[PDB]
Amino acid sequence: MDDANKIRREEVLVSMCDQRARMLQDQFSVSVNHVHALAILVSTFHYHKNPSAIDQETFAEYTARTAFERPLLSGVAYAEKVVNFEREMFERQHNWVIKTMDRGEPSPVRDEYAPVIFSQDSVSYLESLDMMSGEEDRENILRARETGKAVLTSPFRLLETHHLGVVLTFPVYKSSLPENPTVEERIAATAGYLGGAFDVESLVENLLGQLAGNQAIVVHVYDITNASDPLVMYGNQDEEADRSLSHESKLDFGDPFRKHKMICRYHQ
Amino acid sequence: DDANKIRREEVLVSMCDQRARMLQDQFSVSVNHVHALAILVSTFHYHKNPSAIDQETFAEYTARTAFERPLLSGVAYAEKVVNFEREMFERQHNWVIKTMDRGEPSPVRDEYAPVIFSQDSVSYLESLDMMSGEEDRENILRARETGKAVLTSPFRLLETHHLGVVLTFPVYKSSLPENPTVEERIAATAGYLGGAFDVESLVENLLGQLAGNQAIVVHVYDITNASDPLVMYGNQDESLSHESKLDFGDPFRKHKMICRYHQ
Ligand SMILES: C[C@@H](CO)CCNc1ncnc2nc[nH]c12
Ligand SMILES: C[C@@H](CO)CCNc1ncnc2nc[nH]c12
């Protein structure tokens, strides 16, 4: 009840929330950095090396053995850019058809596609799926290749698991990319897309659930890219929580196109 | 005195702790990225047959990922070569295994750790037997016997003579058993992936540009032997200090940061 004890109660909330935000941000940053390395791996060992050192078996092995490097990711995969003019050739070479993500059916005719050719076994169900056949993934692919940098989706329910998460995508370019490229040049030089699923629902719960004092606190994370349309990224927004006091902790997941925040309250 | 003294202490603690965290974190990021490179050499050079990694490819990949390893001046891969294999090895590589101190052809040794892949920043390592330097040799043995990353004491690095510490990870053959004994680890050793933490230059770059640097004296000590602390960073000087914690990830070594005001 005490007013002095209430001041310390807020102090503890601030400290607990800020620490959890720092942990989330750092672990995401670590994962993004190692995804960047994998993009460079595909460029160096698949494209530049004659012949390629990377087949599906090799990609699976290397990503499984390095899974610890990418803590908030459920899996990574590499999608190759395929223009329609090339599709029949691509399918014949690979001995499979490009499929849609919603039903795993043969893709209808599209101007281009992003079929997954390499996958971590944890996301093996992505193999042959056109990652341009989901809207979140399509928008990410385009912004990745146009900006040259890592990009994040809005929160959505991921394939197979239906877990609420976000996808991270990095562009991979051909050696023909000019120095100081225009966006038009980036697009022309695009080889493909190295992506990873941040399974927020499962893996952030796992992270937070092991911390001392977790039962005392309610943690929510929001995508606030659009001020007037905040989107839940993590948490049950409306569970029994202490309505009188909250704290907002800063989060920066590294994509200037997106904005995020964490909000913590006590249970009772 | 006196309220101002309290504030002065609180500033020192904050300054020192922040510098310590920054250094530990950058070290940790580098170690993790070096572990990934050890895994890459294993996957591409040993698990694939024929090998699908070479000097050109290693140099390209390490150059492009240099940003991932902030306190490291360079990385290289040294392969385990036992004496009976030396003739075949030298014929395959078209060069002789050389000593670190003079670059002379190595006298006969039971085994050697010649650098076969190198980042171009440490190109001078190529063909050098990393067992011909005592700090590197001890590191190599402990890396292979423990199965984990290891650090040297502070010592002066090749070429630059900068004071630094070497990080080594073991790379094993697929014949390594599960829950191996140390004898099994040695027998299954393929090589050693290492790099030099150039403390003198790169930690100075990290800490020296920070606001308030002119007001404090910062040291980092290797305190593995409490009775013989060894300077890793700072001057050779021997009231109000503060000790900030550091953990660079090798249980065999211990370190600490000490900060003091000038006056
Ligand atoms: C391979 C890359 C290409 O940028 C996207 C990964 N995208 C995804 N990865 C895993 N699960 C998903 N569920 C929906 N999208 C997903
Ligand atoms: C390739 C690895 C094998 O453990 C050692 C790196 N060791 C070193 N790397 C760079 N400079 C050095 N100066 C002295 N030793 C050095």
From Swiss-Prot, chain B:
Outcome, altering residue 136 to A/E/R: Loss of activity
Effect seen on changing residue 155 to A: Loss of activity
Binding site for dihydrozeatin: 136, 158, 168
Cell compartment(s), UniProt: Endoplasmic reticulum membrane
Induction: Rapidly induced by dehydration. Down-regulated by Pi starvation and induced by cytokinins.
CHASE domain segment(s): 49-258
Domain of life: Eukaryota
Processing and modification events after translation: Autophosphorylated predominantly on His residues. Activation probably requires a transfer of a phosphate group between a His in the transmitter domain and an Asp of the receiver domain.
Effect of residue 157 to A: Loss of activity
Annotated phenotype, changing residue 76 to L: Loss of activity
Annotated knockout phenotype: Reduced sensitivity to cytokinin (mostly in shoots). Narrow vascular cylinder composed mainly of protoxylem cell files, with no apparent metaxylem or phloem. Hypersensitivity to ABA. Strong drought and salinity tolerance only in the presence of CK. Reduced cytokinin repression of several Pi starvation-responsive genes and increased sucrose sensitivity. More rapid germination, reduced requirement for light, and decreased far-red light sensitivity. Reduced sensitivity to N-isobutyl decanamide. Impaired benzyladenine (6-BA)-mediated repression of the iron uptake pathway.
Record note on what altering residue 194 to L does: Loss of activity
Free-text tissue specificity from the UniProt record: Mostly expressed in roots, specifically in the vascular cylinder and pericycle, and, to a lower extent, in leaves and flowers. Present in seedlings.
Binding site for kinetin: 136, 158
Residues binding trans-zeatin, per UniProt: 136, 158, 168
Binding residue positions for N(6)-dimethylallyladenine: 136, 158
Intervals, Extracellular compartment: 1-263
Subunit and partners: Homodimer. Interacts with AHP1, AHP2, AHP3, AHP5, AHK3, AMPD, FBR12, WNK5 and At4g15630.
Function text: Cytokinins (CK) receptor related to bacterial two-component regulators. Also binds the synthetic urea-type cytokinin thidiazuron, a potent defoliant and herbicide. Functions as a histidine kinase and transmits the stress signal to a downstream MAPK cascade. This protein undergoes an ATP-dependent autophosphorylation at a conserved histidine residue in the kinase core, and a phosphoryl group is then transferred to a conserved aspartate residue in the receiver domain.
Name this protein carries in UniProt: Histidine kinase 4
Gene: AHK4
Parent-record interval covered: 150 to 416 of 1080
